[PDB]
Design a protein around this motif. Structure first.
Motif, PDB file in Angstrom:
ATOM      1  N   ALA A  54       0.842  -1.214   0.000  1.00  0.00           N
ATOM      2  CA  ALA A  54       0.000   0.000   0.000  1.00  0.00           C
ATOM      3  C   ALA A  54       0.866   1.249   0.000  1.00  0.00           C
ATOM      4  N   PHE A  55       2.064   1.128   0.580  1.00  0.00           N
ATOM      5  CA  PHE A  55       2.941   2.304   0.657  1.00  0.00           C
ATOM      6  C   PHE A  55       3.403   2.754  -0.722  1.00  0.00           C
ATOM      7  N   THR A  56       3.925   1.815  -1.507  1.00  0.00           N
ATOM      8  CA  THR A  56       4.343   2.118  -2.883  1.00  0.00           C
ATOM      9  C   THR A  56       3.206   2.669  -3.731  1.00  0.00           C
ATOM     10  N   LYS A  57       2.057   2.011  -3.723  1.00  0.00           N
ATOM     11  CA  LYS A  57       0.852   2.469  -4.409  1.00  0.00           C
ATOM     12  C   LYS A  57       0.456   3.888  -4.006  1.00  0.00           C
ATOM     13  N   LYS A  58       0.295   4.211  -2.728  1.00  0.00           N
ATOM     14  CA  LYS A  58      -0.084   5.564  -2.311  1.00  0.00           C
ATOM     15  C   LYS A  58       0.943   6.588  -2.789  1.00  0.00           C
ATOM     16  N   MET A  59       2.216   6.197  -2.656  1.00  0.00           N
ATOM     17  CA  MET A  59       3.284   7.139  -2.998  1.00  0.00           C
ATOM     18  C   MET A  59       3.311   7.475  -4.476  1.00  0.00           C
ATOM     19  N   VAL A  60       3.160   6.479  -5.354  1.00  0.00           N
ATOM     20  CA  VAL A  60       3.168   6.812  -6.785  1.00  0.00           C
ATOM     21  C   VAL A  60       1.825   7.358  -7.244  1.00  0.00           C
ATOM     22  N   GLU A  61       0.742   6.888  -6.641  1.00  0.00           N
ATOM     23  CA  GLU A  61      -0.559   7.392  -7.087  1.00  0.00           C
ATOM     24  C   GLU A  61      -0.765   8.861  -6.773  1.00  0.00           C
ATOM     25  N   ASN A  62      -0.282   9.310  -5.624  1.00  0.00           N
ATOM     26  CA  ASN A  62      -0.505  10.693  -5.208  1.00  0.00           C
ATOM     27  C   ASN A  62       0.551  11.659  -5.694  1.00  0.00           C
ATOM     28  N   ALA A  63       1.416  11.194  -6.606  1.00  0.00           N
ATOM     29  CA  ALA A  63       2.497  12.088  -7.048  1.00  0.00           C
ATOM     30  C   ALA A  63       2.052  12.973  -8.206  1.00  0.00           C
ATOM     31  N   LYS A  64       2.571  14.186  -8.298  1.00  0.00           N
ATOM     32  CA  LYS A  64       2.423  15.040  -9.459  1.00  0.00           C
ATOM     33  C   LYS A  64       3.287  14.559 -10.629  1.00  0.00           C
ATOM     34  N   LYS A  65       4.502  14.142 -10.278  1.00  0.00           N
ATOM     35  CA  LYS A  65       5.479  13.680 -11.242  1.00  0.00           C
ATOM     36  C   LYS A  65       6.138  12.371 -10.798  1.00  0.00           C
ATOM     37  N   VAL A  66       6.125  11.373 -11.657  1.00  0.00           N
ATOM     38  CA  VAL A  66       6.938  10.153 -11.472  1.00  0.00           C
ATOM     39  C   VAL A  66       8.124  10.196 -12.425  1.00  0.00           C
ATOM     40  N   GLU A  67       9.315   9.871 -11.914  1.00  0.00           N
ATOM     41  CA  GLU A  67      10.476   9.803 -12.814  1.00  0.00           C
ATOM     42  C   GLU A  67      11.223   8.495 -12.564  1.00  0.00           C
ATOM     43  N   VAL A  68      11.844   7.994 -13.614  1.00  0.00           N
ATOM     44  CA  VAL A  68      12.617   6.762 -13.508  1.00  0.00           C
ATOM     45  C   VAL A  68      14.082   7.121 -13.734  1.00  0.00           C
ATOM     46  N   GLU A  69      14.942   6.426 -13.011  1.00  0.00           N
ATOM     47  CA  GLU A  69      16.377   6.631 -13.125  1.00  0.00           C
ATOM     48  C   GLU A  69      17.060   5.280 -13.307  1.00  0.00           C
ATOM     49  N   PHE A  70      17.583   4.943 -14.481  1.00  0.00           N
ATOM     50  CA  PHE A  70      18.318   3.685 -14.665  1.00  0.00           C
ATOM     51  C   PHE A  70      19.701   3.802 -14.036  1.00  0.00           C
ATOM     52  N   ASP A  71      20.284   2.681 -13.628  1.00  0.00           N
ATOM     53  CA  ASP A  71      21.639   2.716 -13.063  1.00  0.00           C
ATOM     54  C   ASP A  71      22.624   2.570 -14.226  1.00  0.00           C
ATOM     55  N   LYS A  72      23.875   2.256 -13.984  1.00  0.00           N
ATOM     56  CA  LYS A  72      24.939   2.171 -14.973  1.00  0.00           C
ATOM     57  C   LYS A  72      25.000   0.849 -15.730  1.00  0.00           C
TER      58      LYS A  72
END
Length: 135
Positions: A54-72
């Motif tokens: 539920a934590f991950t879901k609430k956090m991404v659902e309530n965001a204005k902006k989601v961004e992804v960052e790939f590693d090396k």
């Protein structure tokens, strides 16, 4: 390392979210953390699995902006999933889970290990505060 924009499609589990990235729907696995799962492995719904989920879901659902960052290193795993750090309004979801005692730092495969120390520092704090998994 650079951040890139993405759009939430659906949260699947504590450690997995479906995103629209560069025009395609893709499943992303959160780098460097292991949450209890509501899927496997194992034993079905583990303890703190619904919480982490539920934590991950609430956090991404309530965001204005989601961004992804790939590693090396490699950017997808053997299941076709994207491997990345996910950010909700500038806050790293992977670190927040760990800071809350809702995830442990995973076994690390270099060179996908850029934020390893940062996460370990948060994990140490959550244990010391005896949160959730650590209680």
């Amino acid at each position: 390392l650079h951040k890139e924009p993405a759009t939430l499609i659906k949260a699947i589990d504590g450690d997995t979210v479906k995103l629209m990235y560069k025009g395609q729907p893709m499943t992303f696995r959160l780098l460097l953390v292991d949450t209890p799962e509501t899927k496997h492995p194992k034993k079905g719904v583990e303890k703190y699995g619904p919480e982490a989920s539920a934590f991950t879901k609430k956090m991404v659902e309530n965001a204005k902006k989601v961004e992804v960052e790939f590693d090396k290193g490699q950017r997808t795993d053997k299941y076709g999933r994207g491997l990345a750090y996910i950010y909700a309004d500038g806050k790293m979801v992977n670190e927040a889970l760990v800071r809350q005692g809702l995830a442990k730092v995973a076994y690390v495969y270099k060179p996908n290990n850029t934020h390893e120390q940062h996460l370990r520092k948060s994990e140490a704090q959550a244990k010391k505060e005896k949160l959730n998994i650590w209680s």
